[PDB]
């Protein structure tokens, strides 16, 4: 509240003094969001600088930029034409087209978002208006089942009192209808089309605090301007029902109503393995710096001793030797650049981009009915799926499925049973016992118990008649016979099931217009009147009512609970215990229950208490607390009738999914804004918790932790936790001469909180705010730093579906909010069991194995130059052909890496699901870490030692028998190039463990192609019109002829390739891995 003058009526009128955003450029725009919804990432004209700025956080890309700016210099270059451009451009361009294609959808999505076609008074009258027209502070005429433009007040409507309905299941998940009131004074003044057009009294209110609970401020209209609230204010996504048309003023509008100001703030998401890649690139960078420095020192000393001391090595410069040393210290930085190659950051892209398609081509993930694809969204985080620790879920919709389906109750204590539970209809199968006498049968439910249809249609006892009459009249639905049938304009989606069951169980319910109700006794019309409407109370958990028969009979009905009616009930019930003993049967299953009764008062106390009660009915404030006492005065001697049980169909396979994911040592927490009873019901209905679970609600945990401040609970595990948003906040405690100890006061209570929470095996949080959800997410993400996946249902959770390390959105339903803000998506819940067991660990092992071999195959390729430096006088002369040094990690050894990345699978997926104990390695990092990397390094370096020092010792003695193709330079390279190309391919052959025809095809193609081009490089048939690049013609076509050039390649291969076989076999036998244990006796 800072004198906004929001101006809820006029169009622009721009009364705004010097208070707009005072920046330094004319791009200044309104303080009040008019209609703009700019949820883009950037603009399409100055995309480049922002994209590239956030692109060069890849240290490897900094490195490659340095290589280009370093190599093209016409001083020391030592390499061929600057042709790193071809792979350099790919890594920075294809990712760009990737996020262009994954971001451009926002344009169209918001365009269709910002068009609604409502009626709004932009001039004189309301007019057709797309959503992007309605400015800040206007007047909207909404229609039946509309789609709320802005969060506005309401001035009039169609209903009496201009009351309205909003289905608040958009900022939350439960779908009970919430009604609202309009402005009290103007309930009679304008209420119409025209006179509002002339209006004044423009109001201001408070800038949002994302609280949804205060809404202060007062009117600016005349006649003793009065305060502002939330009961006359509307929200964004609320859908409309039974409220044909309305009228109000717009206070908050644009893309900053409340939710755009509590939900959002995307971030660039990077997987865990990426951080390790960056660290290790830093380490290899510094290592090659030291190598180049030491070698340049060597070169300078050798030149001083021998450089000017020769004559055949005459240069055109008298540059001092130390200048040569400096001038060669930048000559190895370019022949040792194959450390940290460019090939890594291209092949990574193919790996990830391929694996995504495997995510979203899975038939077993393809839903049947809805025809939904289960498609990925990001196509870059595909390996995080193997390192999860905590899953955060929203009960609304995700676990349940918005269906109630009344199950059964008892009569005089006898249960209804399941399949037959009667004499007749017993030798047939379990098939339905036909309901046919019901004129409006249309049963969306099918029962199999039959004594409950024979006693109905026959009439053996009016106890059931009492039950069903109560189940009908004690409703709150707006029954109305509009179109042939009788319409049930529902209010609370709880009684609906029983009401419809009674409706099609003969007892069709009829009109209840004002005070008089009507109902069909087996179709026969009857009429009553309500003696007193006695509503529900949250504490009371009951709603009573009384009807009078036309001839002068009245009843009572409770519609209550057990621990609320088993105290005030009749004292002369023997059947109370049979009903109770059925009820406590109902506890070993997982559906909620209510208790139903009546009291026999006709006239002796009806009027006597009635006069006092009606006198107390009118009240300034004693209508809910003192009127309650006289209200509850007659609430004794409840002569009981029976009970009722309501189920809640939720999903499929969910208990099995929860079991499996518990096996894999994952912690699963449920966060939602729904109330406590539903939370407790789901606690058992999904088997997160059973007997032997000391729940110890928020009060208890607060008290005990305050006392204790092992893991600070009575040891024994299995302590599920139930928490209110208020009590969550209370325990978190966040509602000149600077000391600021509050954070010191906090930030341990948080640590103790999270430790308690982990030491409880489950956590349920009811009545929580969308801000609170992501808040606890990144709380627990800070302490005990882990990996988090958030699976969502709707719009309230979009704040936390975008904070965790991974976000998954359920699709195929109404879902369109998460499905655009997700990172993965699919159309069930049990499908999760395959995402993290078949795809997660497969992806993790594929990527780790690839990334671990891809450094060995480069180290064991580049260190040969370093070892050779000693015998060319530190001169930066390569040890390879130059039509080979460039094609090595392009064409020779590139395919098998990719095929093993994109095809290899540890064990068959089916038994992988059958054994969810394999997953743990991903969490514990038993495949990649800061140690296995150095092992790859130390295994490549030894291979270089061998590769160089075998042909060396071969070439210090004669090799030429009769053709005289002895040692020279152009042979000391071929006889080592061949050894290098053979060793690495044999190694990848050893690592892979899922052979296919295409794998072996690729490997043997690699070897065969290298030798084929070894020959065909030595034919001038292609050296024509190419006369200055294929120098190494006729070198190996001679060299390979003799035997001594062989019988050393085999020696090197053997000596460097057996010890890895020895280590593999040894460590396999002595310390088998889980996959080994499964695989050996895998038929068993």
């Amino acid at each position: 509240e800072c004198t906004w003058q929001v101006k809820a009526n006029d169009r622009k009128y721009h009364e705004q003094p010097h208070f707009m955003n005072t920046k330094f450029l004319c791009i200044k725009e309104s303080k009040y969001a008019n209609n703009a919804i700019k949820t883009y990432k950037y603009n399409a004209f100055t995309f480049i600088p922002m994209n590239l700025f956030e692109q060069f956080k890849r240290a490897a890309n900094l490195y490659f930029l340095a290589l280009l700016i370093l190599q093209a210099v016409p001083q020391i270059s030592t390499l061929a034409w600057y042709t790193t451009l071809v792979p350099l451009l790919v890594v920075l361009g294809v990712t760009a087209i990737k996020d262009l294609v994954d971001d451009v959808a926002r344009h169209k999505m918001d365009k269709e978002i910002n068009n609604r076609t409502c009626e709004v008074i932009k001039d004189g009258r309301f007019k057709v208006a797309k959503w992007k027209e309605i400015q800040v502070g206007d007047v909207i005429r909404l229609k039946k089942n509309d789609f709320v433009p802005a969060d506005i007040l309401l001035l009039s409507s169609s209903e009496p009192n201009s009351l309205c309905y909003v289905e608040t299941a958009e900022l939350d998940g439960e779908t009970n209808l919430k009604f609202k009131m309009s402005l009290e004074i103007t309930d009679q003044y304008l209420q119409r089309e025209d006179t509002l057009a002339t209006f004044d009294g423009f109001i201001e209110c408070e800038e949002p605090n994302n609280r949804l609970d205060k809404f202060t401020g007062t009117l600016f209209w005349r006649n003793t301007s009065f305060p502002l609230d939330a009961d006359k204010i509307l929200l964004r996504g609320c859908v409309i029902r039974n409220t044909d048309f309305c009228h109000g003023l717009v206070i908050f509008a644009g893309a900053d109503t409340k939710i755009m100001k509590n939900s959002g703030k995307t971030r660039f998401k990077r997987t865990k393995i990426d951080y390790l890649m960056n660290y290790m690139v830093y380490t290899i960078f510094v290592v090659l710096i030291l190598l180049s420095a030491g070698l340049a020192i060597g070169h300078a000393y050798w030149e001083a001793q021998v450089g000017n001391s020769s004559w055949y090595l005459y240069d055109g410069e008298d540059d001092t030797p130390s200048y040569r040393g400096f001038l060669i210290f930048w000559g190895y930085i370019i022949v040792l650049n194959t450390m940290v190659p460019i090939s890594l950051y291209v092949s990574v892209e193919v790996i990830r981009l391929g694996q995504s398609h495997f995510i979203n081509w899975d038939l077993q993930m393809y839903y049947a009915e809805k025809d939904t694809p289960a498609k990925a969204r990001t196509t870059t985080l595909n390996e995080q799926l193997g390192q999860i620790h905590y899953i955060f879920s929203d009960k609304t919709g995700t676990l349940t499925q918005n269906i109630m389906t009344f199950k059964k109750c008892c009569i005089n204590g006898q249960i209804y049973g399941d399949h037959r539970d009667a004499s007749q209809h017993n030798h047939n199968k379990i098939e339905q016992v036909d309901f046919s006498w019901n004129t409006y049968a249309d049963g969306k439910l099918a029962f199999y118990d039959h004594y409950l249809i024979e006693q109905i249609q026959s009439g053996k006892e009016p106890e059931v008649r009492q039950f069903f009459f109560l189940l009908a009249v004690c409703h709150t639905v707006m029954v109305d016979r509009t179109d042939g049938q009788l319409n049930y304009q529902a209010a609370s989606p709880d009684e609906g099931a029983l009401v419809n069951a009674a409706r099609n169980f003969g007892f069709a319910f009829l009109a209840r217009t004002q005070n008089t109700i009507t109902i069909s006794e087996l179709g026969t019309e009857r009429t009553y009147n309500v003696l007193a409407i006695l509503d529900f109370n949250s504490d009371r958990k009951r709603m009573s009512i009384i009807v009078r028969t036309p001839e002068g009979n009245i009843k009572l009905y409770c519609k209550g609970a057990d621990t609320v009616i088993y105290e005030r009930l009749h004292r002369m019930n023997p059947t109370k215990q049979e009903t109770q003993d059925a009820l406590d049967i109902f506890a070993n299953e997982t559906l909620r229950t209510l208790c139903l009764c009546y009291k026999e008062i006709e006239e002796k106390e009806f009027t006597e208490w009635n006069k006092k009660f009606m006198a107390a009915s009118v009240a300034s404030t004693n209508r809910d607390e003192a009127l309650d006492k006289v209200y509850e005065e007659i609430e004794k001697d409840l002569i009981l009738l029976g009970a009722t049980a309501i189920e809640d169909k939720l999903q499929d396979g969910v208990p099995e999914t929860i079991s499996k994911l518990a096996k894999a040592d994952i912690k699963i927490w449920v966060l939602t804004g729904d109330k406590k009873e539903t939370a407790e019901n789901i606690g058992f209905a999904c088997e997160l918790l059973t007997e032997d679970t000391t729940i110890c609600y928020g009060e208890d945990i607060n008290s005990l932790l305050h006392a204790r401040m092992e893991s600070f609970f009575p040891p024994g595990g299995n302590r599920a936790l139930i928490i209110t948003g208020s009590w969550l906040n209370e325990i978190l405690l966040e509602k000149t001469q600077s000391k600021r100890r509050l954070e010191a006061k906090k930030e341990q209570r948080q640590k103790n909180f999270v430790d308690l929470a982990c030491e409880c095996s489950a956590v349920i949080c009811c009545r929580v705010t969308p801000k609170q959800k992501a808040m606890v997410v990144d709380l627990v993400k800070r302490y005990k730093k882990a990996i988090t996946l958030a699976i969502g249902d709707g719009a309230n959770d979009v704040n936390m579906i975008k904070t965790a390390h991974i976000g998954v959105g359920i699709s195929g339903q109404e879902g369109m909010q998460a499905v655009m803000s997700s990172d993965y998506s699919f159309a069930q819940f049990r499908y999760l069991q395959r995402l993290l067991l078949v795809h997660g660990r497969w992806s993790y092992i594929r990527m780790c194995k690839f990334l671990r071999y891809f450094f060995y195959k480069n180290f064991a390729f580049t260190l040969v130059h370093f070892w050779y430096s000693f015998f060319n006088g530190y001169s930066a002369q390569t040890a390879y052909e130059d039509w080979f040094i460039t094609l090595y990690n392009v064409l020779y050894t590139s395919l098998p890496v990719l095929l093993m990345g994109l095809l290899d699978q540890d064990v068959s997926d089916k038994l992988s699901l059958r054994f969810p104990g394999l997953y743990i390695v991903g969490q514990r990092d038993l495949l990649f870490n800061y140690k296995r990397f150095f092992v790859s390094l130390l295994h490549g370096v030894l291979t270089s030692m061998i590769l160089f020092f075998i042909p060396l010792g071969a070439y210090l003695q004669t090799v030429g028998q009769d053709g005289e193709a002895p040692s020279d330079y152009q042979s000391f390279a071929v006889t080592i190039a061949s050894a290098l190309v053979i060793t690495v391919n044999f190694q990848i052959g050893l690592d892979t463990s899922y052979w296919t025809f295409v794998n072996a095809f690729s490997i043997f193609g690699s070897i065969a192609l290298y030798f084929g081009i070894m020959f065909d490089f030595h034919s001038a048939g292609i050296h024509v019109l190419f006369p200055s690049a294929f120098q190494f013609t006729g070198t190996a076509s001679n060299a390979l002829r003799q035997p001594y050039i062989w019988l050393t390649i085999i020696l090197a291969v053997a000596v460097c390739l057996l010890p890895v076989v020895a280590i593999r076999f040894l460590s396999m036998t002595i310390w088998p891995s889980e996959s080994d244990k499964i695989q050996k006796h895998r038929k068993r």
Binding site: Q961, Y1044, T1069, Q1079
Partner: protein, 330 residues
């Protein structure tokens, strides 16, 4: 959206094959290798020790050396002579050829000092080479056609050998001077500039190399071996790979039927000393020996193969016993 297509590839059920890698499979490879290296190793080591080799160290760096007298004879081409002796005569054909040491023929600033196009016989690169032979591209604005440090410094020395008779008659040895090259290089690698057989007027302006005391076209009267085809010229072109190396210099031919190619006794090596290595320890020498139907003299391969085979065999049994100990035990 519609259902995904069906493909065993897309569903990852393609036919496969798992690793039958077992304690039973592993060991036979170790042991079959352990007995496949020793036979070849000894079979080649015997031949290695069955070759007779002799160096001479033509350099003679000490003052007592018989050739020190021509260390700095900057007056005339020293026609020096040394005596030596061999103990047992040879058979077959023999090769005689020189060798250097501490001569970094693989240096970077040096291996990149050739001009392949002009060597090939190109008309153009002839009258205008490529700017890479930096000190000497236009000494006085003329082509230097065999241009480059590699070609500049082809070492100049003439050797001859005699066998002394019973009346102090050192008769000459009939040594051949052809075929000692790659058959490829004398055919395609680089040829003379085209035209008729003169080699004189087709080298206009192509001045001699600075350190070449004489221009190429009188290198050898033989029509083939003059120009860019003088086979020794090529042999020096093919750069070696280390600071120590032998280049083929001349061959011999096995005499008619059976008698010693070179019966034992004293021999006289008379050589013109013309080349300055005495500054970088370049102890230049010549050697000479035979070649069998198996190979040269290379003990290192024999010893390496023997050691590797024995070690592989040795480790195999340890693997056997350890897997025996740890099978179905703990």
């Amino acid at each position: 959206t519609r259902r995904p297509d069906n493909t065993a590839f897309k569903q990852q059920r393609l036919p496969a094959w798992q690793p039958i890698l077992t304690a039973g499979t592993v060991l036979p490879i170790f042991f079959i290798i352990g007995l496949i290296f020793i036979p070849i190793g000894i079979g080649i080591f015997v031949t290695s020790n069955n070759i007779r080799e002799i160096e001479i160290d033509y350099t003679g760096t000490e003052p007592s050396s018989p050739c020190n007298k021509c260390l700095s004879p900057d007056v005339t081409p020293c026609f020096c002579t040394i005596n030596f002796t061999l103990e047992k005569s040879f058979e077959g054909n023999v090769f005689m050829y020189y060798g250097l040491s501490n001569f970094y023929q693989n240096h970077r600033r040096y291996v990149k000092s050739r001009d392949d196009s002009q060597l090939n016989g190109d008309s153009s690169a002839l009258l205008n080479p490529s700017k890479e032979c930096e000190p000497y591209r236009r000494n006085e604005d003329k082509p230097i056609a065999p241009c480059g440090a590699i070609a500049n410094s082809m070492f100049n020395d003439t050797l001859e050998l005699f066998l002394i008779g019973n009346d102090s008659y050192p008769i000459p040895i009939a040594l051949k001077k052809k075929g000692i090259a790659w058959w490829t290089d004398k055919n395609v690698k680089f040829r003379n500039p085209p035209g008729g057989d003169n080699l004189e007027e087709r080298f206009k302006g192509t001045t001699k190399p600075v350190n070449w005391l004489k221009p190429v076209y009188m290198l050898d009267s033989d029509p083939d071996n003059n120009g860019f085809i003088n086979e020794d010229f090529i042999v020096w072109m093919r750069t070696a790979a280390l600071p120590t190396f032998r280049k083929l210099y001349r061959l011999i031919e096995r005499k008619s039927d059976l008698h010693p190619t070179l019966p034992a006794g004293r021999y006289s090596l008379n050589v013109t000393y013309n080349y300055p290595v005495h500054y970088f320890d370049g102890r230049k020498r010549m050697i000479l020996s035979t070649i069998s139907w198996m190979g040269g003299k290379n003990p290192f391969l024999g010893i390496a193969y023997i050691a590797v085979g024995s070690i592989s065999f040795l480790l195999g049994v340890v693997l056997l016993v350890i897997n025996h100990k740890y099978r179905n035990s703990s």
